[PDB]
Design a protein around this ligand. Structure first.
Ligand code: A1EHC
Ligand code: A1EHC
Ligand code: A1EHC
Length: 147
């Protein structure tokens, strides 16, 4: 029935069914639709004090907690989903990855190159789809599959 990683769940505040993906952490009301050697993705990274390197082009010393980083990620996802801001604009302004300068674009990659939670989420996304918060040793990511 449902494509890889997708499950049905129950809204606590409304009672309506929704869909959640335990590989990408995406969630949506709509029933999802449904592997290539390579995918292309953009991402927005928010680092935290336990990141493998807690420093970035934005801040010499990253001191925010992982919980604070998750709140920031959740807020960016809200703004992207409402259309108030674009993914590319938020990545350019706020991603702690040097790829911020390229609107978050990482280029194309195969399995075996990225950190595993990032790789698994990227390959479970369909072209055009966006992840929820994805956790790695670098921090917390929002991933957009572009090809
Ligand atoms: O896959 C269909 C789909 C997924 C996500 C979504 N968000 C708003 C409308 N949406 C439709
Ligand atoms: O962080 C790795 C990476 C990937 C792509 C890229 N484009 C501009 C800077 N960039 C950095
Ligand atoms: O190989 C990873 C990497 C690092 C730095 C960088 N700058 C532009 C593209 N880039 C890719």
């Amino acid at each position: 029935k449902l494509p890889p990683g997708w499950e049905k769940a129950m809204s606590r505040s409304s009672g309506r069914v929704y869909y959640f993906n335990h590989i990408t952490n995406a969630s949506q009301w709509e029933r999802p639709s449904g592997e290539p050697a390579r995918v292309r993705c953009s991402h927005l990274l928010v680092k935290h004090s336990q990141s493998r390197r807690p420093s970035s082009w934005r801040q010499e010393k990253i001191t925010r907690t992982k919980e604070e980083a998750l709140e920031l990620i959740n807020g960016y996802i809200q703004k992207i989903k409402s259309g108030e801001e674009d993914f590319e604009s938020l990545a350019s302004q706020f991603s702690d990855c040097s790829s911020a300068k390229a609107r978050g674009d990482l280029g194309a990659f195969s399995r075996g190159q990225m950190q595993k939670p990032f790789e698994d989420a990227s390959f479970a996304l369909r072209t055009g789809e966006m992840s929820g918060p994805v956790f790695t040793d670098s921090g917390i990511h929002i991933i957009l599959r572009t090809e």
